[PDB]
Design a protein around this ligand. Structure first.
Ligand code: PLP
Ligand code: PLP
Ligand code: NTZ
Ligand code: NTZ
Lengths: 831, 831
């Protein structure tokens, strides 16, 4: 039998085929004689979507009947990936659709590769959101992910001459079978305008209006029949002031100018985190905050209140019925906006509105590196949003009065912890507005949460230590194990069962097969098959025959200086220099695969991508190197390429300067799928080593105390250049043009940076790194010992399930109890 | 029984209900507890669309098997109206859906009023196209209407203070159930660029590319199971040079700037015909021409050639397999564009390509008034389209050489009939390019076609008299009789049967009931019911209780000076002045209803709309007038309001200065539905009077000889002002402010125009008009005599069926034989 990838029932394969042909004809308006793979993909997509509308409808009615506390997860990013296989998996439908389509003569795996990725994310942030939504539905929570429906997702990367070329991601060219446009619930978002003070209230008057049309996507829980909702807002011009204030213009042009209000959801801002002070960005931010809060209050006004008991619109019970999670400072405006709707329109006292706002709101901090912090120009919030900058001033004023009452005379504290930064451009510190106005603040890994309490939010911690918490990131076992690695999920399933997909802690039962020759041959058999498929796919749809017998060494994640892909490059060049030095000496063979996208304006990231392809140019055509070493740049890394590379890797690179990667989630995906980690004590790498023991990790380099000590004495890269002749050789190979022969000067900016302005200390972790790399090649040479260190990683992945993360959020921040018990499946009834 | 509006079969009402509930749940993702009328409308729309995909698919496969000559009707306008009831009607589905929804507790008529109008038209032109497509499908023709899918149709008119206020028509807010986006057939349209001459061919190189994505709408023939296609193109940015030429810009902004190539199908140009030299217009024009011609050639390369016999791509057989009809000069570029594709890309000799182009192309002229003629600036075609302005020069050059060979020494002929007009701005006369390059040129009524041969295309006629023809416009009996007036279609059906809906000439058999008291009571009973519904609807969804016992006097059509709504106003004021003069004298009571939209920039049309509401202001609140007279301005006249007003009218106003309305089609809709016509000898009014006899019309005023005679001596309105004291009174009532009391000066521009610059001679037809109006009130007083003049109009409407027009086009221009025999209905098979 295939796997136990659901049952492939006799009646159930019949009904699927019938339904597939009903949509090819009626929905696609094709007949099997004119239909492409694409049309076949859409006929399956619609037949699978049919199976979850019954549940979606029953799940929502259900939340209205028993009125639970609802969780609204506000994220300007959700990186969802392809959703056909995830839907079949969470419904138990995958070998039925696989039997069914096979009987129609269709390879289901061809049809799945047809689907565009919903790449409405940049990377770790949007994917954490995607992974949390799958767990919230799996934990039975009344939760709604609330985002912007971008027309253009993250750009498609093209490597054109070794240089990244960006291309627009038109993911909707062919439509999306998964959403349901809900025009009926269009809502108004107000922008610009002014505040006039009646001696009764403040009114924000004279505003331009943009309409927000919701689009819902179903989020199915794993086999529990819960289908929750991801609501994404789309911007629409009002077809009224646009044609109500005329006063010269021209009719055609008043109609052309509407794609100017619709531009607010045109595109995802490509900043794999760094901050850009653009008005379009603040507008996208305010758009998802104002539209969503209207939906929250709407759903609160109805319920067991817009119906009965203590008859005033009781906002006192708002925090017990509502929880909104601010995923970074991107939705921070949900705090002066919930104060606006409460104080201005519901007319509550300022102090009572504030008690309700902090009891509702919670903030997650995702990074400590300062270029990623949102600090908005006040002339910008004054122009665009004038009531909110007034409310924000009021929050700041009353906050400092309580800080000053607690730390009397500490004038510096006050300057430090102000929401208003004075300076060249007066600005508002959005992080500070989120700690002031949330009842919980949290980091994404234990090292990061501590660093928040010890450096960046130290003063805020001293005031309100009770707010700071930690919720270590997680990954969902479904896509990141059952979906991308059916083979590995099957041999685990054989030994310990299938219940491990709702609690990955049962993977701990695998420790008992570390010494079991069948299991060691099985764990290594599937890793060798996965490596055979990714080797194949790569030739087939991209390039050169890579050796499946190499150690697949892969670093896939956004190109940044802190993530230190130039440190991995120094190691690759080191390897090539040792082969050339001693050509006829055996080395363990490697296929180094580095991939990720660079934000368009980050010139150094773009230069780093050119280095890696320039190293591929040299190494891969050296006859003396032969086959022992290959350098490959994985073009257009996205969620669906991650489901391909990560099951095929032997070594995971997680090499960030200690203290800079807040958590990482790529690192956890690689631990679940049988790759060992070489990594610094950074982010969740610390808790990963601790979970499997240091002896099962290749942890190395400076620790955070060591980066501070080094920074206090002063970091000087020249010193490493002197003491290490292999680092001398490399640097001079860069400067003189060995890797760029037609343009000797080409990598001069990287040399100079390393040498003179390296904020991330690449050179200080070089000897410990290249030595730690000698120990993993050493272990690789002993197959049986690699596979058992691997079995001790896999066996110890349970903490890293987003189901653990979410039962921690539910319980310690939202006040909700996670259930995982099947709701009734609709079967017939249309209500 | 309801009517014989199809059968309401037992199994068939069952299957419809089941299918209605399957789409409410699965397609709308609603349950009957949360579903509005709107959601009910869309569940019926999708169940009715299901019934025609089987036929659409079988009809297209069919045209490929037996390979007929195909007709491509190119129109920048199709004014389709609402399509639910037209689809139920052409499929025999209307009392089944009516039983079915009633049994679900739904008033089907509520649900039909939910549908937006596809208002992709301005008026007579787009609606003629809509009416032709219904007849082509009904006459079994392999025909495709080819247009632009505008995002914004014709603006919605708001009368705000008596002034027209325009509003954007967002007809797609809620989606369209009728189209099928066909992304798979996106095609490239080239713009700008340059021509370089290789000494082998000319290449148009360096062009910007815009993508054209097709959207198909099914056009169902009346009960013959033919479902043909209306393909509408949508503009899309290439997601490649837009992000392939960077060279400074900014990534976000390169993605925002795509709504700039997508602007080509953003909006319908609102010019109820007059001509505006805008680049966006030439671009929309070139867009539908280039995309469509790629589809024509594509479908020609395949067939019984891209398969077999005399093995070169035989363009010689192109005119025998292809006919494109140029509906006005808007698609005239189909002539240098078919020469481009043939000469530049297929490499045919110039002379051979020209024989194929004129044998394919035919041109329909729709008006003679000069402000409507397209004369494009050469610096514009040189910039935007440089190969086409070069090809056009080449056509002009070889045309004048044959003119000069036929009329030797006639240097003025040559200046006159040139495609290039010299002058201040050198220009290209598109009408002239269409007569040069088409094998048939035609007018839309016998008077208009003659006037073309005698004035405007006289020189072209003298050269090639064989080209000029006439095809008198028509209206489809289905929407304009069976759909809007089921009652009238039923009592005709009772007496003479139902076969009259495929040949309206059988209405001639009705002459036999002119003296039949049952039929005279029936014809007048349904007109009184229709007048009761339109009186009701008007209060209910708009305004004041109008008297159903009045003569409903209505003029609905675009506001222009030539259509002479100010002449109808002079008559209304005349009536009000006679009541006031002699208040206690019986007059026949009237409800005058004037309605139509004004192009946004035509200040006089906007002033005329303010006059009519200003006359409504006065008259409708005069207590002495009481109820004998009411003036109503029908706000936002569109196809669906036409299906409401036209069945409820007693008098049709068709009052154009003789020689200016080329045909009219409103006039024919009113003759089919039992209204008598008061009209000048203009357009098809001439053939309408002739069809029913002059004695059954209220024909009046100057004839065309009389407008020429008057123009040669010199038209002077002052002379009419002197001889007619009732016209003096009115003019001075306008000048002094009787109708505009707060602003006496307000109608000063209209007075001045009438008095000093009336190109359409309103004053010269005033006495004959107001006297002719005394004769219709006279007849109205004799109910039995009105209803029998009416029965002689209705009985004589057959010539005015677009089925006659199209069997004339098919046979005398396209070389096709009309069939009307049922194709097989699919019943089960999905191929
Ligand atoms: C998981 C994931 C990430 C996160 O990677 P890190 O290494 O944690 O920075 C980024 N992009 C994609 C495509 C992912 O799947
Ligand atoms: C038929 C029709 C017209 C044509 O009217 P004419 O009086 O011939 O100019 C214009 N608009 C609409 C809505 C129509 O139905
Ligand atoms: O918490 C989710 C991820 C973390 O895993 C990364 O370490 C951090 O750089 C980040 N920034 N935004 N989102 N993220
Ligand atoms: O032929 C269709 C209609 C005619 O009936 C009108 O008389 C004419 O003004 C016109 N202009 N464009 N289209 N049309």
């Amino acid at each position: 039998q295939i796997s136990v990838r659901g049952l492939a029932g006799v009646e159930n394969v019949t009904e699927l085929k019938k339904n597939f042909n009903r949509h090819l004809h009626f929905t696609l308006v094709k007949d099997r004689n004119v239909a492409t793979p694409r049309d076949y993909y859409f006929a399956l997509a619609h037949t699978v979507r049919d199976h979850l509308v019954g549940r979606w409808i029953r799940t929502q009615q259900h939340y209205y009947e028993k009125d639970p506390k609802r969780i609204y997860y506000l994220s300007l990013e959700f990186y969802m990936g392809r959703t056909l296989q995830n839907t079949m998996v969470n419904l138990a439908l995958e070998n039925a659709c696989d039997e069914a389509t096979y009987q129609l003569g269709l390879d289901m795996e061809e049809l799945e590769e047809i689907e565009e990725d919903a790449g409405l994310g940049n990377g770790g942030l949007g994917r954490l959101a995607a992974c949390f939504l799958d767990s919230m539905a799996t934990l039975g929570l009344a939760a709604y992910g609330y985002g912007i429906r971008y027309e253009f997702g993250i750009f498609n990367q093209k490597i054109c001459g070794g240089w990244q070329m960006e291309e627009a991601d038109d993911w909707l060219r062919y439509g999306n079978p998964w959403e349901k446009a809900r025009p009926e619930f269009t809502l108004p978002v107000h922008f610009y305008g002014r505040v006039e003070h009646t001696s009764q209230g403040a009114k924000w008057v004279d505003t331009q209006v943009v309409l927000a049309m919701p689009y819902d996507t179903p989020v199915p829980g794993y086999r529990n029949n819960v289908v929750n909702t991801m609501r994404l807002w789309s911007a629409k011009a009002p077809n009224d002031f646009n044609l109500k204030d005329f006063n010269v213009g021209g009719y055609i042009q008043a109609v052309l100018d509407r794609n100017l209000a619709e531009n607010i959801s045109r595109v995802l801002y490509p900043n794999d985190n760094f901050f850009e002070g653009k008005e379009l960005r603040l507008k996208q931010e305010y758009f998802v905050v104002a539209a969503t809060l209207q939906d929250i209050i709407r759903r609160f006004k109805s319920s067991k209140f817009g119906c009965r008991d203590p008859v005033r619109t009781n906002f006192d019970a708002f925090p017990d019925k509502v929880a909104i999670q601010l995923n970074d400072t991107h939705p921070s405006l949900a705090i002066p906006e919930l104060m606006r709707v409460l104080v201005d329109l519901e007319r509550l006292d300022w102090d009572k509105a504030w008690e309700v706002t902090v009891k509702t709101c919670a903030y997650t901090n995702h990074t400590v590196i300062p270029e990623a912090l949102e600090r908005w120009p006040v002339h910008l919030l004054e122009t665009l949003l004038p009531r909110h900058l007034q409310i924000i001033y009021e929050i700041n004023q009353r906050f400092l009065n309580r800080v000053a009452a607690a730390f009397p005379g500490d004038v510096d504290r006050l300057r430090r912890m102000s929401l208003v930064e004075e300076g060249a451009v007066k600005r508002i510190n959005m992080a500070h507005l989120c700690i002031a106005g949330s009842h919980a603040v949290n980091g994404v890994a234990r090292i990061h949460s501590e660093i928040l309490k010890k450096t960046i939010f130290k003063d805020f911690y001293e005031l309100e230590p009770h707010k700071f918490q930690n919720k270590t990131n997680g990954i969902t076992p479904r896509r990141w194990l059952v979906l991308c690695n059916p083979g590995l999920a099957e041999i685990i399933a054989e030994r310990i069962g299938e219940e491990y997909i709702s609690d990955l802690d049962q993977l701990r039962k695998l420790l008992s097969y570390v010494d079991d020759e069948a299991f060691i041959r099985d764990v290594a058999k599937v890793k060798q098959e996965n490596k055979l498929k990714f080797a194949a796919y790569l030739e087939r749809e991209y390039k050169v025959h890579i050796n499946p017998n190499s150690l697949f060494d892969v670093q896939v994640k956004r190109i940044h200086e802190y993530k230190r892909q130039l440190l991995n490059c120094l190691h690759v060049i080191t390897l090539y220099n040792r082969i050339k030095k001693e050509p006829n000496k055996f080395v363990v063979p490697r296929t180094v695969m580095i991939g990720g996208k660079p934000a368009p304006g980050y010139h150094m990231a773009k230069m780093i991508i050119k280095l890696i392809t320039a190293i591929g140019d040299v190494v891969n055509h050296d006859p003396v190197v032969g086959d022992r070493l290959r350098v490959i740049f994985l073009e257009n890394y996205r969620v669906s390429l991650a489901e391909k590379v990560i099951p095929a890797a032997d070594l995971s690179e997680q090499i960030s300067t200690a203290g800079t990667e807040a958590s990482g989630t790529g690192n956890m995906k690689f631990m679940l799928n049988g790759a060992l980690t070489i990594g610094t004590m950074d982010g969740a790498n610390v808790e990963m080593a601790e979970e499997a023991g240091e002896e099962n990790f290749f942890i190395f380099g400076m620790r955070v105390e060591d980066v501070d000590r080094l920074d206090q004495r002063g970091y000087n890269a020249q010193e490493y250049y002197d003491r290490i002749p292999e680092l001398r050789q490399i640097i001079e190979q860069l400067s003189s043009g060995f890797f760029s022969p037609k343009q000797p000067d080409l990598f001069k900016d990287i040399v100079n940076m390393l040498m003179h302005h390296d904020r991330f200390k690449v050179f200080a972790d070089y000897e410990e790194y290249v030595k730690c790399q000698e120990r993993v090649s050493a272990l690789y040479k002993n197959p049986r010992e690699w596979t058992r260190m691997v079995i001790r990683n896999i066996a110890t992945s349970g903490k890293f399930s987003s189901d653990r993360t979410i039962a921690q959020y539910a319980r310690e921040i939202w006040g909700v109890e996670p259930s995982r018990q099947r709701l009734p499946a609709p079967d017939e009834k249309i209500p």
